[PDB]
Write a protein that binds this DNA or RNA. Structure first.
Lengths: 95, 207, 147
RNA sequence: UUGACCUCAAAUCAGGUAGGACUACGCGCUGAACUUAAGCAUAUCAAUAAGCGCAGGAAAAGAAAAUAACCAUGAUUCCCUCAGUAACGGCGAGUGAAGCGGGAAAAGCUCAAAUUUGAAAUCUGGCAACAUUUCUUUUGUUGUCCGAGUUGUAAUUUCAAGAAGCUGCUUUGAGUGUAGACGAUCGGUCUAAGUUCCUUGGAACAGGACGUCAGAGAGGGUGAGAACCCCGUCUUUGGUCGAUUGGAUAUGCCAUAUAAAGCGCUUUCGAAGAGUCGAGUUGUUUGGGAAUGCAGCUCUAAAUGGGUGGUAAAUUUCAUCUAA
RNA sequence: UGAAAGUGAAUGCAGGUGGGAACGCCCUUGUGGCGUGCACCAUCGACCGACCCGGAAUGGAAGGGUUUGAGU
RNA sequence: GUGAAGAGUUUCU
């Protein structure tokens, strides 16, 4: 904290305190009951046809092809990698 | 055509601007109407203060962070520190702002003292007349409408008149410090990346 | 007022000062400043050079608050303090030195122009030029940076 | 055969409701061209004119899927400024916002997602009774029955939190009458003063003499320029109705008022909106520039997830917010 | 000042030269000699920013330039 | 949408 207007830790130096936890920022956390409901719904339903195709590609070990298919199906590569990780976990749990 | 001296014309009057002309011939009338409205509000809410107590906050830019202005409402942390519940604050005229937070003990204490001063100067009429409950005032006879800022105004930060010159101040090079800090702030990421890449390359060569 | 206007003096003169040959027809050379590259070029290039063209790089969503930095020179530094402080400190020897908060006065950077009295002073500013720092040190004062 | 449920019908069934007019302002859809660019097609006119749908006394917006990058701010709206600026534009003609700051005004909240399960505690309608009224015209309460509702009506919760718990803290609305008043007030005003003389004139309200009142010499009428002829103007209390806890010891005095909230330490949990976000493309629009917003089509989500941080892409952090 | 990141105006009486208002002093009556010299113009320099250099991880300080700015 | 044949863990006719 240089206490200046330039540098890595610029700005006036005060007595920093611990902010209270914001309940809104808790969003995105997975609850036990929510996970249970989602697992039941996954059991009741199945997988989308694109999800099955991606799972088959992962089983065939065509990782790049599966990633490209997931990216095209879902849009952004970030969501593609998340879906790939989820489907890989499903496959290895089946194994 | 343009043949005269001066800057080139820039008039933005190529639309039907004459049908959207706003005159101000009602300015004295609006001023009188607003004054009458606030006088009526003062009479109807008497003896409660016309303007509610407001916190002191710092504006959020380097252009204005050296000043102090009035905020929207007191934070929950400030109300808890001052001993006022969020539900009772509205009843007694203390605004509550759930969005603002106290990142510094300076701002926390600054607003807490304001709430304490307001509570000390506040007269709370009993819910039932003649039966002062917890927090009620037993001397509500001398109650009158007063300006909140007349007893609790917003105060600006004071500057130091003078102080002795220190040897550290003598040896301090302000321009060199500014130049070094500016260069460091932009090249630190490159230096950190270089160190990480050097460590990775050295480990890979070792492998 | 209207009675002092040239229109009153032009009553009885047919052309109203606009000529018999060229007259005062509607826009004969276009509207506004159109034609600055074709038929108004002799005026644009002579009186407004640099009008046509692109120079520099764009900056999307410019905000001037982070760039706010008015400057004050050294010869105006002692003007910022009140008269009482000037009488109490200027021209005399004291254990303490007066503090001039340039940021509180309303400036972001201290620039070195003019001279300073031979008396120490504490200049509190976010930025300072190199020459200003040398002159302040020569005068006997120091500059401490603030945020 | 019947009943029940489900779905769908009919009735001049019982009770209701909508249309249409007004468009200055307001919320949207659709949507030009004249014109400027000295021609003209993008642009401009203009997200305007015309057309269409829909409200109120205001409408809309509104309590952040907001800014910022700070010592940080903090619902919406409007004014000044930002600013003719960033930016857009055959970068031509032209167009053109937003953060901060000052001011006006300020007010916060409600659902869905929870098992009440030791008792659907919820609501509508018919009938009857009892109240009430701007009011025989209005608005309710109670009892009973029938329906709605378990494919979910009530209660505690809405993230600012909160629930399950744990241990000690305090306990409250409606009828009358007086004094001061407050909307309409109107039994209406104590509400002041020359119509004296002379001249002219058809008429004095003109001129002159002598006066008067003024918190009233604003205005109008009267046979010509009238403060004192008339209406008025200025000042100023009161008979009345109603809002009558709008207030005070609203006293006086009925039961409002025995269990609902109140903060406190400790943990365990903390349910949070889907053809939606998001991605691509097309059209339109915007200052929004490898898309500002809107819409059509294709693909189609996730849970520390998702949106935003104004240059497209990948990766690692950070800040802020919590959409459908 | 630069597109920008940024940097940011005294060697000196805030400089020298020529003309120059006004004033003062001497001449000795000449369209006079001397001393300063406001305004303004011309000119030689100095300083700030930009450009081009030498170049003595990060910094560009003394040293410079035939230049450039709507600067001091 | 559902099935049967031909074919270089998959879909062309």
């Amino acid at each position: 904290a240089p206490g200046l207007v330039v540098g890595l830790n610029k700005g006036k130096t005060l007595t920093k305190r611990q902010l209270p936890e914001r309940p809104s920022r808790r969003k995105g956390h997975l609850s036990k009951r929510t996970a249970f409901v989602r697992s039941i719904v996954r059991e009741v339903a199945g997988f989308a046809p694109y999800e099955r195709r991606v799972m088959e590609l992962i089983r065939n070990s065509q990782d790049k092809r599966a990633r490209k298919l997931a990216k095209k199906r879902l849009g952004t590569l970030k969501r593609a990698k998340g879906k790939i990780e989820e489907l890989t976990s499903v496959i290895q749990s089946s194994r | 055509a343009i043949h005269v001296k001066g800057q080139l014309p820039n008039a933005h009057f190529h639309k039907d601007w004459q049908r959207y002309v706003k005159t101000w011939f009602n300015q004295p009338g609006r001023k009188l109407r607003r004054r009458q409205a606030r006088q009526t509000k003062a009479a109807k809410i008497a003896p409660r203060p016309v303007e509610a107590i407001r916190p002191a906050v710092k504006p959020p830019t380097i252009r204005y962070n050296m000043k102090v202005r009035a905020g929207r409402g007191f934070t929950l942390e400030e109300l808890k520190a001052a001993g006022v519940s969020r539900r009772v604050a509205s009843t007694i005229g203390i605004p509550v702002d759930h969005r603002r937070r106290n990142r510094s003990e300076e701002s926390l204490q600054r607003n807490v003292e304001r709430i304490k001063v307001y509570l000390a100067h506040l007269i709370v009429f009993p819910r039932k007349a003649g039966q002062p409950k917890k927090g009620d005032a037993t001397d509500v006879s001398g109650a009158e409408q007063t300006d909140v800022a007349a007893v609790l105004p917003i105060t600006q930060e004071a500057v130091e008149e003078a102080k002795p010159i220190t040897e550290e101040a003598k040896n301090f090079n302000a321009f060199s410090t500014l130049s070094n800090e500016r260069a460091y702030a932009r090249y630190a990421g490159a230096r950190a990346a270089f160190q990480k890449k050097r460590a990775e390359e050295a480990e890979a060569k070792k492998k | 007022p209207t009675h002092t206007s040239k229109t009153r003096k032009l009553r009885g003169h047919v052309s109203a000062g606009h000529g018999r040959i060229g007259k005062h027809r509607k826009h004969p050379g276009g509207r506004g400043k159109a034609g600055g590259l074709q038929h108004l070029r002799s005026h644009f290039d002579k009186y407004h050079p640099g009008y046509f063209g692109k120079v520099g790089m764009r900056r999307f969503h410019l905000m001037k608050n982070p760039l706010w930095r008015p400057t004050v020179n050294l010869d105006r530094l002692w003007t910022l303090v009140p008269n009482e402080t000037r009488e109490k400190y200027l021209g005399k020897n004291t254990e303490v030195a007066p503090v001039i908060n340039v940021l509180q006065s309303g400036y972001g950077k201290v620039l070195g122009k003019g001279r300073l009295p031979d008396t120490p002073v504490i200049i509190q500013t976010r930025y300072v030029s190199r020459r200003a720092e040398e002159k302040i040190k020569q005068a006997g004062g120091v500059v401490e940076l603030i945020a």
